[model samples]
Target: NLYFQSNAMKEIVERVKTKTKIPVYERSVENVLSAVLASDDIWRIVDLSEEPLPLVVAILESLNELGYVTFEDGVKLTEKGEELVAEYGIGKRYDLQAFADLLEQFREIVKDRPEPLHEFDQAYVTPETTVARVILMHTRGDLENKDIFVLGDDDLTSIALMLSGLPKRIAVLDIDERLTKFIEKAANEIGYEDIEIFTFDLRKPLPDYALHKFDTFITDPPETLEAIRAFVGRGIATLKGPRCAGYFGITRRESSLDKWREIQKLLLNEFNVVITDIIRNFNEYVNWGYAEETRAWKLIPIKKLPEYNWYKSYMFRIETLEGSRGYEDEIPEEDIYN
Candidate 1:
């Protein structure tokens, strides 16, 4: 049966590869298979796999063609699919329907919020991803009874953190007045009393009272070098010292490998921190309404727009060393958006 199972897995992968437009690997198929075993929702599967929607769709199509999946109501697998997974030794899937439902609920709540300002580089990750971040932080022991600082709250990470009831305190600062107000309203409505909100920009030094006062920090900064310096720098300023962690997102679409190398140098050499973890495609951003007004849209070769949420970023975690330092100088005002 071992030989038969191995052959079936290889045969199915080869057959599916022919049906997909995007390149497919065994690991990709395995991720999707595990997700299908766990949930019936397509978006939940995509989130679990951390793969692009198009790729997930293509694979599903291929699997359906091969008689392994059915879309009667939602994505459901056949007995053959279960047999294949049993052979593959795939484990149990995390039930993520609650998280999916939460995303929809938050989307409805914040639907009337102000549109993302292109000038401010404001784009939001899916609300599920925000809760996912909190879960990850909790797993890392960064959230339990610790002061957590949010350098920006456009994603409303503060609200998600408050929901977890893990952190000792949470503080949020954002340059956008509309975002801060919305977050404040949500926090108040939810009866979260331990959070503080400030309409403050990251370019300037952190408030004196906030300096070195937190155990963990989070921000999703603009991909530009200056923006990373200011946003991530401010995150460091809020941390107490060694072993404290920081979280931020940087996208591959806008930032080149050269830029990543420079960013790495700044984190390691300038800030005296060690890159602890980098989760690729962990931050899936919801498409902003004003995407067409941005430079990325202008660079598209064809006129057809993307049908799926096309933007994603690598979530980074860096921890301070003994002599870690934070950037304190006021950032020179210039074009930080590329």
Candidate 2:
């Protein structure tokens, strides 16, 4: 079985992975619970070290309240827990209809989204990109129970990811107050209480409170080479440690191959990061070129609408090297969101 989908117990953890050369599963409360629910027999805390010790210990104390299990030489599931095993979990194999319906639902929910502001070069992706991006990242096991930050979510990927139930916490930093309110409102209406947002413009230095507080980051900065550098630099600065990861969208439409090469070089050589995967055409945006007919879209586009989906973005993932990419770089462009 090559596929696994998250169940409602949810991805949970405290520093799901530490500074380790090898990968590790996060032991968030939801993760610990899922493992407990899936296990065939009793297990020890040592058995659950696949989860963080602190989280494993914490879940044990809290499990009694869940009324499904209790701590012992190992955790012994009570009759209550035994009965619910069938009701909780993940399995191998995906159903296409699952996503067809998921994307349909996403589109319906965000139909009235705020217009993509041109000053920031914002262009919203279709629901397919929203669903596909998270599904891919979740399938790769990068998002479970981990804390992630959206350097900028003009596309509302944070909301899409939240719907997957693969991440524990998400925060959005965008220059657009419309995006901030739209996402926060959408999150609340959809019952996703964990999606936090702030109306922030990242051109300034990273705040101590927001710095190094994330396990991963996702962004779609402006396509300019300089913008990519500033965006990735700030994203790198937000990671907590070396075991962190990043996912971002770039396109060949606006950025030259030379720009991509230069950006990649900056990530690998200067930022101490490595490219793990690059998924081509993983996202499609509503052409900034027109069709302001839809609710919340702008009418002042420079080009006419195309007959088919005419815009796409590449998906590239990168992981930090020895530790978090502790960094300092200038965002000299004062017209960042101009």
Candidate 3:
């Protein structure tokens, strides 16, 4: 619900209007940049030679277009970028360096992780986004000894939660044996033993022995509406009571409002859950997205129009309400991933 009239909302809209070619939710570019700029020294004028970050790479590009930063010639802020931040930048902030640095550790562990099987649309985000998800969850009291379940682990986010040394227990259901093996190795390496894994394909019913037993559900389901309904249904099926919730990612770039409406109809009207929050550009993946062209096409509208960091998905949290639709649909097998 992007409200257009408020003065505060106007500021957010104005900052991102230049990239109208990008998706409307690209307001995330402004939100994230404001966080970076508000930081004491994240927007350093130095040139970067590291792996391109999902949003950072795109942020610099947009800023470059607006003449705020220079990315092509060098990866550094222009005087105008600094000046713009000093004035119009939103003041909300975070420890940008801390999370970005955290990725280096995650990156090291991820080296041994499984390569996403194209058949599964196995795109993954960087350690920065992974770490940020954990931090935000912990901050919001969603971490710690809660029973958390991940429907898909291709992103290796389960390990991030594992490394947090929080969560009483973490369980994963991935169609790929490779992901289960990778997570097992990760658990062993950290000696973080509260993790569980199962090889379960979602095209069928969820694993039976564990129905309605989790406190939280986390997944980045395939973006197709069919897939969204399937994944969201699975998440709904796992909740213990009305208070339990689910977190996942989807993008306005690939998922239009009409599509969102259809999915939400199942989530809100048919299934009983309240959409609690949507954190923009919360999941940033690498270049595998460009490989999905036609299928997903180097497809972050912010980039082709935008694929800046490949593609990024916003984080969403929805909580179940009593009497809500509770997984009545058994997803029929469909070779859609193919």
Candidate 4:
């Protein structure tokens, strides 16, 4: 029945893609469908599917038109939709449900964190997404007793990782003093003895103390080539040797396919790393306050602010290869940010 379901889902996805100018993928459709079937709340569907809110809303409408979903007192799947989900074995993962609860608790703790600075391109990922990301790292056997290097602390992932008590040590670097202070305060308040945070600008060379001292690195760098090099280059510098992995996020919204290809080539040829995984829409960024001023907002025809989290990035895991090297020299600030 999976074969038949695949054809059916593909046909549905094709129809839905034709209904909108926005690019739609089969995986998005499947995620939306599975979330709709899993939970009736619109917000729950948004969180569970991890798709753009506009796209999720559009999919809901399309599924309703196709007689697969119904909008009664609340969002719910029709008999046909239920049958399809059963056939496809599409349901929310049990693990993510637990993380959803944990995310709620974390939201309370990070609610008072500093606002994002537009100059630094510091939009934070949703607390839910951050928690889920930490869980993903743990599942990958990357967190336990690992010395993790965080290139930026704006997302507060370092705090999340420390709270998990898995990593042997967490070293965080951020250009923003406010973010570093905030993370530092959280570390002190939690009485965590293994967290180290410093307000160090990435434009400078990696500190001699940090070079080649970590088991893993985590960063969400700006999409510019120079930014990528400056952030990831220093990240590679912190790794001990081969098999040391780094996690980062890139997005189609900010980076074109060609840019992505070029970045991939840089990783393989220049940095000497192998891309182990690239999970699409894995990092859901919160809508920042200065959305109207951003290039992405200006390019869109609609001038209105988004009601839900719209910006997303694909999570990438890259591991070092033999003789891997990192760019440790200072980079001109002008070349780093667009």
- Candidate that beats the other on lDDT, 3 or 4, i.e. the better one: 4
Give candidate 4's error at residue 183 in angstroms.
1.1
Better of 2 and 4 by TM-score: 4
Best by lDDT: 4
Error of 2 at 77 (Å): 73
Measured on C-alpha atoms, candidate 1 has an lDDT of 0.75
Q: Please state the error at residue 123 of candidate 4 in Å.
A: 0.5
Q: After superposition, how far is residue 96 of candidate 3 from its true place, in Å?
A: 5.1
Best by TM-score: 4
Model 2 residue 136 distance off true place after TM-score fit, in angstroms: 0.9
- Candidate 3's displacement at residue 42, Å, is 27
Ranked by TM-score from best down, the candidates are 4, 1, 3, 2
lDDT of 4 by residue, 19-100 (tens): 6555677777788887776666665565567665556666777777788887663577789988878877787633267666
RMSD (Cα, Å) for all candidates, in order, is 9.8, 21.6, 9.7, 8.4
Q: Candidate 3 — what's its lDDT?
A: 0.65
What lDDT does each candidate get?
Answer: 0.75, 0.64, 0.65, 0.77
Number of colliding residue pairs in each model = 0, 5, 12, 0
After superposition, candidate 4 runs with Cα above 4 Å error: 1-95, 100-102, 294-303, 330-338
- Model 1 clash pairs are none
lDDT by residue for model 3 over 1-338, one digit each (tens)? Answer: 46543243344445555534333344454554554444322222101111123334344445556676544332334686666655554454443366654567678899877776778767788778888888887777777889898888888888888877788999998878888888988899888888888665555665665578888888888767777877877787887877787889977545655567777776776566799888776787765645334321222332332325635677888887777555633664442212
Question: How far does residue 22 in candidate 4 sit from its true spot (Å)?
Answer: 18
The local lDDT score (0 to 100) that residue 272 gets in candidate 3 is 61
